[PDB]
Amino acid sequence: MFTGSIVAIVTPMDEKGNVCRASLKKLIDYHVASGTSAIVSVGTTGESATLNHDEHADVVMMTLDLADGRIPVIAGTGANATAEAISLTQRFNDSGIVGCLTVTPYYNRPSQEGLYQHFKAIAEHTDLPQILYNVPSRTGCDLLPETVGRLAKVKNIIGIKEATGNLTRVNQIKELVSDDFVLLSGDDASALDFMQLGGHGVISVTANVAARDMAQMCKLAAEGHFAEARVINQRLMPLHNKLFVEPNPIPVKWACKELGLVATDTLRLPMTPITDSGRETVRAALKHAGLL
Amino acid sequence: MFTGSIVAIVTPMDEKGNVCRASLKKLIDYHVASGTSAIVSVGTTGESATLNHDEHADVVMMTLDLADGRIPVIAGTGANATAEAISLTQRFNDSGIVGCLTVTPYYNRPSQEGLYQHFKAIAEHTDLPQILYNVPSRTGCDLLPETVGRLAKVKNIIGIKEATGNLTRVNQIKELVSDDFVLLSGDDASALDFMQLGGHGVISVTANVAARDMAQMCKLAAEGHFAEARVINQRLMPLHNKLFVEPNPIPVKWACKELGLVATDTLRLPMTPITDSGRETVRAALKHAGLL
Amino acid sequence: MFTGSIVAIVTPMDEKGNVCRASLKKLIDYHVASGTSAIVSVGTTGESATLNHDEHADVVMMTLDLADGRIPVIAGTGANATAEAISLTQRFNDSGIVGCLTVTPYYNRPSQEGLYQHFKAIAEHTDLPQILYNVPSRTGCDLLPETVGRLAKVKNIIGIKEATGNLTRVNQIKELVSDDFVLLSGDDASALDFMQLGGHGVISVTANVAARDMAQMCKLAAEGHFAEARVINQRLMPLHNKLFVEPNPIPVKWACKELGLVATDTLRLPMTPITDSGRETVRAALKHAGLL
Amino acid sequence: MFTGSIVAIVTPMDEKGNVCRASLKKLIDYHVASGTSAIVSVGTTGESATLNHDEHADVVMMTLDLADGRIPVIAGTGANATAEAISLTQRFNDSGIVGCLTVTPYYNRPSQEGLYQHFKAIAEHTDLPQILYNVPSRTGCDLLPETVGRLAKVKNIIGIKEATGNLTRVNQIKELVSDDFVLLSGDDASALDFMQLGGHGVISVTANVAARDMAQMCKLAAEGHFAEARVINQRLMPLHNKLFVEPNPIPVKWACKELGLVATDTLRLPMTPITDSGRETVRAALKHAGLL
Ligand SMILES: [K+]
Ligand SMILES: [K+]
Ligand SMILES: [K+]
Ligand SMILES: [K+]
Of B103, B107, B109, nearest in space to B131 by CA: B103
Q: How far is the CA of D37 from the centre of ligand 4 (A)?
A: 21
Contact C192, C229 (CB under 8 A): yes
Q: Which ligand does the CA of D159 lie closest to? A: 4
Cα angle at B248 between B242 and B253, to 5 degrees? 85
Of D281, C81, D193, D13, nearest in space to B194 by CA: D193
Among D188, D193, D230, the strongest candidate for a mutation testing the B interface, having the largest count of B CBs within 10 A, is D193
Rounded CA-CA distance D178/D173 in Å is 10
- Which CATH number belongs to the domain containing residue B7 in this structure? 3.20.20.70
C106 is catalytic: no
* Helix spans in chain C (H): 21-34, 53-67, 82-91, 112-123, 136-139, 145-151, 168-176, 191-196, 211-222, 226-242, 250-259, 276-289
How many Cβ atoms are within 10 Å of A178's Cβ, its own excluded? 9
Which domain does D9 fall in, by range?
1-292
Q: Could you tell me the sign of the dihedral formed by the alpha carbons of D179, D182, D183, D189, in that order?
A: positive
Rounded CA-CA distance C3/C221 in Å is 11
From B184's Cα to the closest Cα of chain A, the distance in A is 20
Rounded CA-CA distance B150/B120 in Å is 10
From C26, C30, C116, C133, active-site residue: C133
Rounded CA-CA distance A7/A71 in Å is 11
Cα angle at C253 between C251 and C256, to 5 degrees? 110
| Kind and range of the H or E run holding B170 | helix B169-174
Rounded CA-CA distance A219/A212 in Å is 11
Q: E strands of chain B, at which residues?
A: 4-8, 38-41, 73-76, 99-103, 130-134, 157-162, 182-185, 201-204
Contact B111 A52 (CB under 8 A): no
| Sequence-ordered list of residues with C-beta below 8 angstroms from that of D170, at least 6 positions apart, any chain | B193, D162, D183, D194, D197, D198, D199
Q: Which ligand does the CA of B123 lie closest to? A: 2
User: What method was applied to determine this entry?
Assistant: X-ray
Rounded CA-CA distance C78/C150 in Å is 19
Q: Is D232 annotated as a binding residue?
A: no
Domain count, chain D: 1
Rounded CA-CA distance C182/B192 in Å is 54
Q: What residues does the ion ligand 1 have nearby, CB within 5 Å?
A: A 157
Show residues of chain D in contact with C106, CB under 8 Å: 106-107, 140
| Sequence-ordered list of residues with C-beta below 8 angstroms from that of D208, at least 6 positions apart, any chain | D7, D8, D9, D10, D27, D45, D252, D255, D256
Contact A81, B268 (CB under 8 A): yes
The strand pairing partners of B202, in sequence order, are B5, B185
CA B249 remoteness from chain centre? 11
Resolution for this experimental structure (Å): 2.3
Residues of D at the B interface, defined by Cβ within 8 angstroms: 165, 167-168, 170-171, 175, 189-190, 192-193, 196-197, 230, 234
Among D51, D88, D109, the strongest candidate for a mutation testing the C interface, having the largest count of C CBs within 10 A, is D109
Running DSSP on this structure, what letter comes out for residue D274? P
Contact A21, A58 (CB under 8 A): no
The strand pairing partners of A41, in sequence order, are A75
Q: How far is the CA of A153 from the centre of ligand 1 (A)?
A: 5
Rounded CA-CA distance B104/B85 in Å is 11
A116 is catalytic: no
Cα angle at D264 between D52 and D283, to 5 degrees? 120
